[PDB]
């Protein structure tokens, strides 16, 4: 997973046009380049080493727990590419890790603690996670899908009548986010503007994997008395103010 993260990180910097990661330090202090990316589970292969291969007395590296930590991938990114002293904040959303990471990165940038942040999320597929997800019946049953005549390239079918669990995958995804003024001063390609980002919980429950409508609060507004438009939504009023 750390290999996937390193590749995705260099490719994200190259998408941002930064061939040399130290080019940030021409424009921002070393304390203003951070890495707020994360993982749902982290180094599951290192956890397998620790919990299974060491129990079996197989030859396992002595620093396997280091590779098992979820912030180790960010640590390796900083140790091999960035060498920044900016904020490092490793989220764990377990499935929303990347969007939560974008949230953390944006608040980090807007608080002034960083000017560049490496956000994103990564995860790896392994025997043990696959078996556990099967036990929780979260993933589709391949035997049942073959019985239904479904090929692997058509087993993952969101929104259909016959959706029966998700298709577990592996990999990483990284984005380089920064202030608009920094992007324009550096002359980097501004691919998008992150206008909004939010995280939320649902309610009382006794089912962790049960999804909920907690993120509906992103659309919250008051509607008791709308007899007149709010002036603040009007662009020219804010412009004269």
């Amino acid at each position: 997973i750390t290999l996937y993260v390193l590749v995705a990180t260099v490719e994200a910097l190259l998408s941002a046009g930064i061939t040399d990661p130290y080019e940030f330090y021409k424009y921002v202090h070393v304390s203003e380049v951070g890495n707020c990316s994360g993982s749902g589970m982290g180094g599951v292969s290192a956890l397998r080493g620790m919990f299974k291969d060491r129990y079996a007395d197989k030859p396992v590296q002595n620093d396997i727990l280091q590779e098992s930590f979820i912030n180790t991938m960010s640590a390796w990114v900083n140790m091999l590419l960035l060498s920044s002293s900016g904020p490092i904040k490793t989220p764990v959303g377990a499935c929303a890790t990347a969007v939560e990471s974008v949230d953390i990165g944006i608040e980090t940038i807007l608080s002034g603690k960083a000017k560049v942040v490496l956000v994103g999320g990564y995860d790896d597929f392994q025997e043990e996670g696959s078996y556990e997800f099967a036990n929780m019946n979260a993933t589709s049953n391949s035997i049942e899908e073959f019985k239904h005549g479904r090929t692997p390239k058509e087993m993952s079918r969101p929104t259909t009548t016959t959706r029966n669990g998700f298709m577990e995958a592996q990999g990483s995804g990284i984005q380089v986010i920064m202030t608009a003024d920094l992007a324009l001063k550096m002359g980097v390609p501004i691919h998008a503007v992150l206008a909004m980002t939010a995280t939320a919980t649902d309610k009382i429950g006794r089912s962790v994997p049960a999804p909920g409508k907690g993120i509906l609060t992103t659309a919250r507004e008051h509607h008791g008395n709308l007899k007149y438009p709010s002036p603040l939504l009007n662009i020219k009023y804010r412009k004269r103010q």
Binding site: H222, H223, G224, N225
Partner: peptide, 7 residues
């Protein structure tokens, strides 16, 4: 969405 909770 109360009529008295905003003003």
């Amino acid at each position: 969405q109360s009529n008295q909770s905003y003003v």
